[PDB]
């Protein structure tokens, strides 16, 4: 089998006899994505071709995503249905990841579709429901954004892409001013630019808040064009932080940067989003709170009046145990990484 060759790792798309049919969907990060007919379950599925074994980073992110997805089981988190690879490490060159077929993502939808308040509400509930599970496993996603939120034709929403995820580590979250960061710029919380490594749950809540804002207007709320511009966008709307919030920033370079800026007043949410439901804007305000300690937590968000039609804690499951396995994976040679990817994928083998 072959699929629309050329460039971007995806000439050969070799998914064994179980999966047939010839439908390019797009480019992932490490290869092409196709839909295919699952001759066993007799439904069409998605297949990602991963060809990560050339780079340490691709491999780390691939191992991370596989370990996490296989351990998680939740309606609002994409699962792995199957993994196709060679029977031996020596022959293992590509890895195919089979998942439920999700026809779009929130990014694509927001390019062309207005969302009713009912859709916004439903999407937000599902995002937070999945996030509650993730956080209950002591895991942080760290790159929540619309393109990492998949949707099917009935509007079921599933969180994807755990390539940047980490185990939460609040005691070791502090860093200096302007510390470089990997996750997508427009969805970074203010503290990332000031004093945070992104090792606490509050980082994800900020991103959800950004996504909420974007659902209300079909435009990213803070589209920074570079590292520090991101902060300037955030302050242009929230206004200058209070003395109390600022006294929380102990590191001098960060504090003094903020102190050097001209005073900016808060732009009221209802002026930015004049057609928004008032309860949505109250919740938005709580998620897009400058001070990460005052920011609302995932369970509190689910409990907010905006989501009252959906909130049901007994039907919002949490993980059976926290993750404590290594998610940094930074001191491992390429050989150990490949071996770990081989071992983590063994359960899908005839073997
Ligand atoms: N954090
Ligand atoms: N503040």
Numbering used by the authors: 7 to 357
Show the paper's wording.
A substantial body of information showed that ERK is overexpressed and hyperactivated in lung cancers. ERK receives signals from many oncoproteins, including EGFR, Ras and MEK, and transmits the signals to its substrates that include c-Myc and ELK1. c-Myc is a transcription factor and well-known oncogene that promotes cancer cell proliferation. ERK directly binds and phosphorylates c-Myc at Ser62 resulting in c-Myc activation and enhanced protein stability.
Previously we determined the crystal structures of ERK2 complexed with caffeic acid or norathyriol. Because the catechol moiety is a part of these two molecules, we hypothesized that catechol could have binding affinity with ERK2. First, we performed in vitro and ex vivo pull-down binding assays, which showed that catechol directly binds with ERK2 in vitro and ex vivo. We solved the crystal structure of the ERK2 complexed with catechol and confirmed that catechol directly binds to the ATP-binding site of ERK2. The hydroxyl groups of catechol were interacting with the main chain of D106, M108 and the side chain of Q105 located on the hinge loop. The adenosine ring of ATP in those structures is anchored to the hinge loop by Q105 and D106 residues. The alignment showed that MAP kinases, such as p38 or JNK1/2, have different amino acid residues compared with ERK2 that underlie the specificity of catechol to the ERK2 residues, Q105, D106 and M108. Indeed, pull-down assay results with catechol-conjugated Sepharose 4B beads showed that catechol did not bind with p38, JNKs or RSK ex vivo. ERK2 can phosphorylate c-Myc at residue serine 62 (Ser62); and we found that catechol strongly inhibited Ser62 phosphorylation of c-Myc in vitro. These results demonstrated that catechol directly inhibits ERK2 activity in vitro.
